[PDB]
Design a binder for these strands. Structure first.
Length: 52
DNA sequence: TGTTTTTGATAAGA
DNA sequence: TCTTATCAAAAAC
């Protein structure tokens, strides 16, 4: 399978930075992942749906 | 088992 | 401007 994009100790690093007020669009080009990845790992609630 | 796991754009409701 | 799951496929082998 492919490699997990945030290299696990970075899941700590991020949880922290975004729960202490950090925008994902920001957090995704410094650690280069896609914003969709970050909402999959650390989400929140409700505004939703589907398709590619 | 030429599979898999996982990303990431993207529709989508909101 | 957001969040959400979907989905085609990259990347690993």
């Amino acid at each position: 399978g492919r490699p997990r994009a945030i290299n696990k100790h970075e899941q700590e690093q991020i949880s922290r930075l975004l729960e202490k007020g950090h925008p994902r669009q920001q957090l995704a080009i410094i650690f280069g992942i896609g914003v969709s990845t970050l909402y999959r790992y650390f989400p929140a609630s409700s505004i939703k749906k589907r398709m590619n």
